[PDB]
Design a protein around this nucleic acid. Structure first.
Ligand SMILES: [Zn+2]
Ligand SMILES: [Zn+2]
Ligand SMILES: [Zn+2]
Ligand SMILES: [Zn+2]
Lengths: 48, 65, 645, 147, 648
RNA sequence: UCUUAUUUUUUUUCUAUUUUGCGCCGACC
DNA sequence: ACTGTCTGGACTGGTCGGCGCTATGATC
DNA sequence: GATCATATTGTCCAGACAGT
């Protein structure tokens, strides 16, 4: 918010970032998987 | 207080040093070493590094600052 | 180094028991900062009259603090009742706090004059009847968050503050009155340049730092943003911990910006002597600087805990109070007149050996807000002077017609129903504009409200908390009369963005005092954006405008300024409101003012060092003073040492 | 004489060693030697004829957890009882972390190192302006070797 | 020594790469290292290097460093075979005296009477010697007059070759710890000798290096340590000494005011590192320190330092020649130019940055061509700041010309020695005594006198050093030494006395002679003995050439008092009638007067931006600075002690 | 009677807008 | 190729209400 | 007295595995 910009720290990619609506429980599950040394890669798809 | 000698590196509670008979005492010291036997290997290692240390059973040190 | 503090304390106790009556019961005599603290068991016989205390202070040359011994102490729940009964009800006491570790009672009251006493006898009577050494502080009529935070920090950290004060007193009096073999002045910054000022007074015994600051303009270049840390003398002083004290001339980023940086990396652990208004304004400005540095995306210079440590290591000195800050160096502060708490630093080295007067930022003409700068000293040998407006053609217009033009522009703007937006600094010109507006509205000229936004309310509250540091007219109005110029009902403060939006949408005429002259941040940008399309409004600039900023762009006559709006799209500001530039409210001394200060200073200094300004301006001012008065003038660069004696 | 390890509470190895020394003095134990280096935290070394004497000597002390089954060769602890300054092995240009002092928990880079005054000079990497500071040689720890 | 960043690995790698790409692979380069300001290259086959003389010059120009090519220790001829080969190769007229070998670096030291024949034209012999010996040679001059000081210094250097080599390697590593660096700021601070005479001390401080210049002691106020010693309480000096950041020390000339405090640092281990100077300055300053500690020991006061720290100073001394540019710091280049004050007196030229700034510290110097020393070099490649002495900067400081003083001395000798008297000329061992005896020898060259001249005291050592270093003398003396077969210092009229028997015999003989003994202002030595034993004689005249300090025997004699109370050994006081004749000719002084200083300021090239006047009285310095500012318009300053002036 | 070192101009403000977890017990559908 | 044995995992959901716990032996 | 590092390491069903 201070910089006002969205970027991927592991990768860079200051341009190709998309907003995804999902449950906060799913975000917590992804955080748990990352803490368990598991990398979930979300392959985004167009809504149409 | 707790003080350690600078010559023989002995740890004593009172002012007098009853092992080497010197009048230099340091309030800062680390590496407490306990000697119980004359022939013990760490006592021999202390002797070759500090010729005036590890002569009698007690407390000693390698470096004094 | 060797310390003779024990022998000095023993001889001081011997002198006391020779002079002070035996029945007083002297138990302990110690050093707290630059003052001498004596603990007694029978304060009734100690201070039957103030003549004995005055004689003791004159003989010992110490700030005598007589406190009851902690062996006897009245209970706080009863001591509060006795203090309330003893203090007249006219002085509205707001808070009473007790320090039992060292017997002290802090009385935060709205009228400290009645609590302190006609000649200080009320404090003696209170500490006689209740057995608690009193310290009176002023309750500000306008509540201030920074002052309350500073007081809470000083109260909750009484143990650390007392230990620091005791160690400072032990370090100061390590030896008796010492005649220095040599005195040297070194400039680590602010020499032939503007900003990042830093002065070093060096003797064979003690070293003193003066107004350590930062350079906002050259913040992109670390070499020019900060005072030179590669100076061998400064490296030696900081490395061996020989810095006896730090003195801040006035609260500004070029004079106090780099102060918390030393405490961030534990490079300094001594005291910082400054006036209370300077201390509070310096913490406010440092907090603001850290906030905008953290917003801009760059790494902040220091954490707020470093500012808290600076507060814990700050010693408050009033105007005209002489204190021993080093075994050969005495320090006093005089009214500079630039901003609130601005102090000209007079350093007396030796017993008449040398005297240095560092003016810093100051004003010589009598302004409405502050008294004129003090041009009289008991002794003066070296004078370090600012050269911000030292050029030959640098002639600021007089204040009278400048304020007349401002008043008439405001009147014409409000006649057509427009809104007046006045961008200004956080301190300095803003409060002067408030005073001018209050004087204009007191006679019935304008009845519209005046809105103060963006930390100007905090500066106004700090100004209210210290009225004795203001001008003679304001002091007369506040103390002798029952009217406070800052407490006018026209002055209003916002609470959130909703109140600002209500003010903007309001159709009635109003005057808005913004927070940023450049219109870079704060509510100034929002007010400019939401009031520019209306042609009835007007904007008045009271400060210089920097290139590349919104303020300079709108001052240059740009009728359409493209800016980055929301959604990442360029939105234009159609500026149809009137633009005015009245730069006659600057708090810096004019070239004529500097010449008058040089001509009217008493006694005439042996040498004058022109600093705090551009190199050409400094050289021109030094040459002009040398040609006019014949005084030896020097304008050295950075890392230049001058041997005064 | 065989070297064995006794695990103790961190920060009070010297107190446990002194307690074991007092127990050996007042209880006639066949203990040959006891060593407690300051650098090693939470463990002490005991030179004894057998591990049984070690576990008997440490028995009864709540601050002595256990005795490791293995036997430490003397070459492993030979360097412990050697006269060598803590500033040795530190070269300028690397990065160190300051364990104690006013700069506790700070990373810096070594600029000047001398062994006569048992001190080292480090410049803080987090400081925007380079200001060297002096710190005791035993107060730093090497994190990455570089010139 | 202190430990620094030491980025010399990359610089050495680049130097090795350039050498490989330039020097042919047949040479077989093995090692490249730095010894002080010198670059040392060890190669497997030196038989493919000096076949063209331009290769070494081109390599030195490309690398911008002095190159000393030495063979590897593996390829080393036996010392006897190498010595006999060197002796047979050189012409017999070279007269090689001593040959010393250092197999650690494979370096031969050849002390010879005529170094020019050994070196040859453009070093063509010096390289070719290696082509038959496979040893790196270095030639020094054996003086015609045997010198104890030079021989002792050479023996100390040869016996301590390992420690000297280690110290040189450490100094070379410290010098090239960074590449070509431009300093952000340059300042100069006067720890001593500023607005005062004696105990001079200059400190040039940059953001990377700190250089000390002309560190000395004051003997006028030796009872007070504050007024006699340089300011050790200066924060910059304390920071430099505590952290060991003093990169180099340069001595302007050999004097107590410029080299007295040098052994004090080594006695207390305050500073260790290189001391850059000229060989005559080093030898004469060692002699001066030796006599200073002898005086302190005989006076009953505690000596300032022992001879061991003097030997340490000798072991930590790097000798440079006139006009030689050397790297003493990552940003500072040091050059020494002729000064003309005394033998080995060097004007210091510090070039800081890549043309960023240039400082010229003249110190004591002379501009008129003296009979023994060449005039000071008034031309420099670049000049921005000039530091010059102001000992005679007063308005009335206009000395008579040297011709008048020489005529007065010659006529005084003529009217005194025709009556059978013995002229006594007390003078300093390093100062104007050499000029006096040169004038006497020139007068004796005509044939108008045949009397002997006795060099009692330490004048013999100074004359031996002068003979050993004739290239530092004037153009006329250098011509007469090199391109003509006669030595003015080797005149048979010059005699040396070793003990008291010969001096007593020549005192009691009554034959006319000229005695030149050193005692300062008759504070102690052979001169006071000569005066006491020649006081009843009325046919001889004493000559005073230097200033006489108040309260001394020389001032009492100059005042014309006929009853001089002189204390004696074993109690009591030796008070006798004095029939001595007193003359005062203050024209042989090696200090430039006001006119010479103004001429040097006018004729200096290029004109400096600022001129700093030091090494003189406060009023004299202020008057000289004001006169220069009024005449030429240059911004002149006369700072006091502990004053830092930022240059750039 | 003698070697191997170099030398110079283009970046700006004194500051800012609704307590989890663990475990137990009981009851209801 | 069969056969008994060792190891691992799950044990319907939801709700109302309560009870109770989440530092301490040295150190100046 | 007020602080401070450390604080231990019931059954049943199904899949995999030595043994004969
Ligand atoms: Zn990515
Ligand atoms: Zn001992
Ligand atoms: Zn300022
Ligand atoms: Zn001199």
């Amino acid at each position: 918010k201070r910089r006002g910009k969205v970027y991927c720290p592991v990768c860079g990619e200051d341009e190709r970032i998309s907003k995804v609506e999902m449950s906060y429980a799913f975000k917590l599950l992804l955080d748990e998987l990352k803490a368990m040394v598991i990398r979930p890669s979300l392959r985004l798809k167009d809504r149409v | 207080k707790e003080r350690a000698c600078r010559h023989c590196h002995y740890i004593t509670t009172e002012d007098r040093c009853p092992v080497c008979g010197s009048r230099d005492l340091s309030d800062d010291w680390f590496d407490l070493v306990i000697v119980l036997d004359v022939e013990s290997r760490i006592a021999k290692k202390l002797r070759e590094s500090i010729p005036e240390a590890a002569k009698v059973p007690g407390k000693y040190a390698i470096r004094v600052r | 180094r060797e310390t003779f503090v024990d022998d000095i304390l023993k001889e001081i106790r011997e002198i006391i028991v020779q002079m002070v009556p035996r029945e007083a019961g002297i138990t302990d005599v110690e050093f707290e900062g630059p003052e001498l603290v004596i603990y007694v068991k029978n304060p009734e016989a100690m201070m039957k009259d103030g003549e004995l205390i005055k004689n003791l202070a004159k003989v010992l040359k110490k700030r005598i603090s007589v406190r009851p011994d902690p062996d006897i102490l009245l209970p706080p729940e009863k001591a509060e009742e006795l203090i309330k009964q003893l203090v007249p009800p006219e002085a509205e006491i707001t808070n009473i706090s007790f320090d039992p570790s060292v017997g002290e009672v802090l009385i935060e009251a709205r009228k400290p004059g009645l609590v302190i006493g006609k000649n200080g006898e009320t404090l003696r009577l209170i500490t006689q009847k209740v057995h608690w050494a009193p310290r009176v502080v002023r309750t500000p009529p306008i509540q201030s968050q920074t002052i309350y935070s500073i007081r809470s920090i000083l109260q909750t950290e009484s143990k650390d503050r007392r230990k620091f004060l005791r160690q400072v007193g032990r370090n100061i009096y390590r030896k008796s009155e010492y005649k220095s073999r040599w005195i040297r002045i070194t400039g680590l910054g602010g020499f032939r340049e503007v900003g990042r000022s830093a002065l070093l007074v060096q003797t064979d015994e003690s070293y003193v730092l003066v107004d350590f600051g930062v350079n906002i303009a050259a913040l992109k270049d670390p070499t020019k943003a900060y005072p030179h840390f590669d100076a061998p003398e400064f490296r030696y002083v900081l490395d061996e911990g020989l810095l006896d004290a730090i003195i801040i001339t006035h609260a500004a980023l070029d004079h106090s910006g780099m102060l918390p940086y030393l405490f961030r990396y534990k490079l300094f652990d001594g005291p910082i002597y400054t006036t209370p208004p300077t201390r509070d304004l310096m913490t406010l400005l440092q907090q603001d600087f850290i906030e905008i540095q953290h917003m801009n995306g760059v790494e902040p210079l220091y954490r707020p805990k470093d500012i808290k440590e600076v507060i814990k290591h700050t010693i408050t000195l009033d105007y005209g109070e002489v204190r021993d800050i080093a075994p050969d160096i005495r320090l006093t502060l005089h009214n500079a007149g630039h901003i609130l708490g601005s102090s000209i630093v007079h350093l007396h080295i030796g017993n008449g050996l040398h005297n240095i007067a560092i003016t810093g930022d100051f004003k010589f003409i009598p302004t409405r807000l502050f008294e004129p700068a003090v041009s009289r000293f008991p002794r003066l040998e070296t004078l370090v002077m600012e050269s911000t407006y030292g050029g030959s053609n640098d002639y600021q217009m007089p204040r009278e017609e400048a304020e007349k033009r401002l008043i008439e522009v405001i009147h014409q703007t409000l006649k057509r129903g427009g809104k007046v937006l006045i961008p200004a600094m956080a301190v300095g010109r803003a409060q002067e504009i408030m005073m001018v507006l209050e004087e204009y509205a007191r006679v019935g000229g304008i009845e519209v409200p005046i809105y103060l936004d963006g930390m100007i309310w905090e500066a106004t509250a700090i100004h209210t908390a210290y009225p004795e540091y203001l001008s003679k007219h304001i002091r007369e109005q506040i103390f002798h009369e029952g009217y406070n110029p800052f407490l006018n009902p026209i002055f209003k403060s916002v609470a959130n963005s909703r109140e600002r939006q209500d003010i903007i949408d309001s159709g009635e005429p109003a005057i808005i005092i913004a927070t940023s002259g450049m219109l870079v941040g704060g509510p100034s940008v929002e007010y400019f954006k939401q009031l520019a399309p209306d042609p009835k409004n007007s904007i008045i600039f009271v400060s210089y405008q920097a290139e590349g900023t919104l303020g300079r762009q709108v001052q240059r006559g740009l009728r359409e300024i493209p800016i980055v709006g929301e959604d990442g799209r360029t939105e234009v500001i159609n500026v149809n409101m009137e633009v005015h530039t009245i730069d006659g409210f600057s708090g810096a001394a004019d070239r004529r003012e500097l010449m008058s200060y040089v001509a009217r200073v008493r006694p005439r200094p042996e040498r004058i060092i022109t600093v705090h300004g551009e190199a050409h301006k400094c050289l021109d001012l030094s040459s002009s003073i040398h040609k006019k008065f014949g005084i030896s003038t020097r304008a050295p660069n950075n890392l230049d040492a001058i041997r005064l004696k | 004489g065989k070297i064995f390890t006794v695990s103790v509470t961190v920060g009070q190895e010297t107190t446990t060693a002194n307690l074991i020394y007092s127990k050996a003095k007042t209880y006639n134990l066949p203990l040959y030697a006891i060593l407690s280096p300051s650098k090693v935290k939470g463990y002490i070394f005991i030179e004894a004829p057998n591990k049984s004497a070690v576990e008997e000597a440490i028995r009864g002390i709540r601050h002595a957890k256990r005795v490791l089954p293995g036997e430490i060769p003397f070459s492993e602890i030979e360097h412990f009882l050697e006269e060598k300054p803590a500033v040795s092995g530190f070269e300028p240009g690397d990065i160190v972390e300051l364990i104690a002092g006013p700069f506790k928990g700070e990373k810096a880079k070594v600029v000047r190192v001398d062994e006569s005054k048992d001190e080292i000079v480090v410049e803080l990497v987090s400081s925007v302006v380079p200001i060297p500071v002096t710190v005791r040689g035993e107060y730093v720890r090497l994190i990455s070797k570089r010139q």
